Amino acid sequence: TRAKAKTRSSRAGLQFPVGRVHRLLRKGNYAERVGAGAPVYLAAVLEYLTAEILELAGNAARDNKKTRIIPRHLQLAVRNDEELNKLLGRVTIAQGGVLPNIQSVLLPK
Amino acid sequence: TRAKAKTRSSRAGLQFPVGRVHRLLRKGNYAERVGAGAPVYLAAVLEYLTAEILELAGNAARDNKKTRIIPRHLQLAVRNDEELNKLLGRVTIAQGGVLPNIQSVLLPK
Amino acid sequence: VLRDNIQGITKPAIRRLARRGGVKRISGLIYEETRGVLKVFLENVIRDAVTYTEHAKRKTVTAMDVVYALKRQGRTLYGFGG
Amino acid sequence: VLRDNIQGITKPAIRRLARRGGVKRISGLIYEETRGVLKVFLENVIRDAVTYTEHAKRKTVTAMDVVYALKRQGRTLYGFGG
Amino acid sequence: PHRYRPGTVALREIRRYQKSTELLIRKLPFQRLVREIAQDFKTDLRFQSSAVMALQEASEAYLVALFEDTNLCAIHAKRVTIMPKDIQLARRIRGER
Amino acid sequence: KPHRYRPGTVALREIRRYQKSTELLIRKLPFQRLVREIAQDFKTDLRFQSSAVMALQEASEAYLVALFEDTNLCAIHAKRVTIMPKDIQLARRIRGER
Amino acid sequence: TRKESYAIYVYKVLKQVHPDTGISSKAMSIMNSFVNDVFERIAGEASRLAHYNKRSTITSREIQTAVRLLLPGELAKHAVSEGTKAVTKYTSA
Amino acid sequence: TRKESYAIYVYKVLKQVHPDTGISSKAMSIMNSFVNDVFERIAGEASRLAHYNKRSTITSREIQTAVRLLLPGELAKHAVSEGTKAVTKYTSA
DNA sequence: ACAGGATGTATATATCTGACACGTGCCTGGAGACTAGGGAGTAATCCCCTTGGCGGTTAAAACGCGGGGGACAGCGCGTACGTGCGTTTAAGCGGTGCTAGAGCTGTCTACGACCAATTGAGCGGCCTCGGCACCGGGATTCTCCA
DNA sequence: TGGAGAATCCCGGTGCCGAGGCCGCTCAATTGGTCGTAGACAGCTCTAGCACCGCTTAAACGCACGTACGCGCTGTCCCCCGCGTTTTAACCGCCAAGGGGATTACTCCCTAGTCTCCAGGCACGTGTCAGATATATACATCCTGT
């Protein structure tokens, strides 16, 4: 006579898993005990960051007249922003490239 | 009818404690279990490094015609060496000072 | 309320710091740059120090908070507890 | 036994790298410096990679060893597992 | 015949190579160099296919960044050509020396 | 006529003198007032221990000395003896703080 | 042999943001690495923060303080708002 | 309230090296901080190394590999020799 | 290239004082002696993926030559920074007083770990089609010399 | 300021291989209940952080003078760039053999947990000696004139 089942993500109204995050926290040698509210917070933060990056990358991809996302678009989206460039300051992205810029002294005149 | 007691440091022939290191390892959230040979190794390494630094500092202090060690002597001993300067590359020592050097271009002639 | 205290870093002190650095001649526009750099550095450290203090429900800033804040940015300090 | 393979980094490749860097004119003594710098960097990474491989009692170097060795020195890499 | 002034093709190449995202070094010489270097630490080693690719990616990124800093140092002294002094100064300020 | 020194001797003497010692080179009360004024924005009605200010001053002075050394190197690279703000900007930009 | 990743949730978020847009495998690998890196950073900072105050539990306050310490600028503000809203909604039900 | 430090052992080592030489309090604080820092570094590296290989124990091999990874040059060689000798002597008795 | 005067600095001697080295008492954390269970070491099997060799083709590397523009040294003019002196202003020191907040007990409850039974979400394997890479031809733009 | 010419851009047609969606099933997340301790709350004590006052003197401030350094201009010459030929090795398919990286079952030795107890290490006094502070002396260095 049980009452079926409901995932904690549905209760919290999220898309990222909560039970998996709880298990990962409990088996990572971080602390002796883990509370009941930390996984929800962590999942929400991760989902927010992912959504931000994906939106910027999709804008770049549409600007280049394509319907798929490739590492070049991610590189452009990260490097053109300010806060994201601050966050990923010492990270290398494979098959990324560089931003185009030339010093003004070298230009012909 | 017990057989008295003997510290593990005496068995290992060391000066640094072993039981305290074992306790610190077991309560630091590093791993689920701790072996029986790690504390001896760690204590030996720590003692060796301490002896090296102290010898160099004492040499500097005697060179300056003193019988006590002050942070200036530690700074001189660390910075004049190569391996130690490599190890403590991003550490600030209070009341230390700097090494004396002047660029050759600035000298009068 | 305090205001206009950045001017307390007089030019003789900057000259002494430059002398310990090994500088021989100094231009007349270095002092404003030095003051700005120092202000930025102090703000960056103090924000984290205050955050550490506030997490523990205290009203007094201790030395361990400063030590932790300095360590978090890659500048370890020896001599004040820790 | 292999020997004298540093000469396989020809000057056209260095010129292409400089072009992507944004350089317009190049002197005639840059190539030896570039080769030395590259050799030092490769030695530093490969030593730690081999140490990681040897701890696990293996005879093949995997990509995860390289990723860990790069991460330990403050150069994180995205794209190869991890 | 037709000739270009010194400096036009350089700018064209700069734009061309700043637009793309490919590798700029031949693969077999790099693999041979990696194996030769690894010979000293241990004998009779074997490599997976992707480890060499990861190493090449990291090396190329490092070199490009170093060249950018060298160009800045060269410009600071009222010049257009880069010289070894610029590389040495850039490495020394960065803390690698 | 009275006695005078050529421009540049006293500078070298001061360089040696200040490279020999290990003291603090900034007055204490202005630094404490500056620290309190800066901390005012983040939270109101704060109190400080006596040693926190000392730790802050130590760190600040070490940072400034290192920066000045790098600036002097950058200035020498361009065939000059006087340091100018361009050197500070270049040193900070290469180091990665900008 | 079973292997775990974050592909499904990333795809769901992408379909939420841009309804008609695909993604290749290399970008998926990059996204997976990014998520793992951020997770590790936040967890380690929270663990150290809990150790300083002589506690043996990790709660929402540690996560919030770690987020404030790590992220710069407006990202911290928006992340804090999102986390607080999520926890408040979860507790009610 | 009890507080722990490494003063006694540092003093013993100093008396071993230089028989007649003192030390002030500030240098003692600096030495204490140095010892704590090195301990923390080695322990963290060993913990990560054990986690990579799917083990749940820390042994002498992890400590040795961490020492080889951390220290540069001859310091690693001499430290390895000292640790091996100490363990060998301890096991016999 | 020297002589000599003027200034800054290292050396040797005599008096205080407070910080460091040592002794004593007490308590709590490390050592000795057992038991119980599961993590890791060892042997055997399977099959994937790394190393080695061969032949053909065309893209990339090496070589030589002719000019032109940029790196480098020398000279001259002007102004801004270093040195020294007299006057003004807060830093530093030694007391006194007051109270806010840090640090330590004692009681109690509600929250997280642990266990047993149940089922559905996520992973591996498989097909299928359309998004992008490639080729060919025409249009537009930028550079260089009279 | 005009033409020639070389490099870049735009548009349309073919084809193939990688990304998207479906199915079976099994292992990990959910539901329900028990229990013991980690942390919340109230109260009290004594330390240390803040504010005020007077005084002596060291450091900050303002001004005048003159010299050395930063900056612009000109000329000579060499070294690097752009282009056409000839030679070398990278790249792509295809085949073959075997070393070593993943699994699975069994067993045993090493580590966690508990109780007793007793020395090593910490907090608190006490005295003396190393170092700090005056004072006279002699040696070293700089700068103008000869």
Residue numbers in the entry:
A (entry chain G), B (entry chain C): 10 to 118
C (entry chain F), D (entry chain B): 21 to 102
E (entry chain A): 38 to 134
F (entry chain E): 37 to 134
G (entry chain H), H (entry chain D): 29 to 121
Mind quoting what the paper says about this structure?
In S. cerevisiae, the HORMAD protein Hop1 mediates the enrichment of axis proteins at nucleosome-rich islands through a central chromatin-binding region (CBR). Here, we use cryoelectron microscopy to show that the Hop1 CBR directly recognizes bent nucleosomal DNA through a composite interface in its PHD and winged helix–turn–helix domains. The Hop1 CBR comprises tightly associated PHD and winged helix–turn–helix (wHTH) domains and directly recognizes the bent DNA on nucleosomes. In S. cerevisiae, the HORMAD ortholog Hop1 contributes to axial element integrity and acts in the very early stages of meiotic recombination by mediating the recruitment of the DSB-forming endonuclease Spo11 and its accessory proteins.
To determine the structural basis for this interaction, we reconstituted a Hop1 CBR:mononucleosome complex and collected a single-particle cryoelectron microscopy (cryo-EM) dataset. 3D reconstructions revealed two major particle classes corresponding to either a nucleosome or a Hop1 CBR:nucleosome complex. We refined the isolated nucleosome structure to a resolution of 2.57 Å, and the Hop1 CBR:nucleosome complex structure to 2.74 Å, enabling us to confidently build and refine complete atomic models and visualize the molecular details of the CBR-nucleosome interaction. Nucleosomes contain two copies of each of four histone proteins—H2A, H2B, H3, and H4—with 146 bp of DNA wrapped ~1.75 times around the histone octamer core. While the histone octamer is two-fold symmetric, the “Widom 601” DNA sequence we used to reconstitute mononucleosomes is asymmetric. To determine the most likely orientation of this DNA sequence in our structure, we built and refined both possible orientations and chose the one with the higher overall Pearson’s correlation coefficient between the final model and the experimental map.
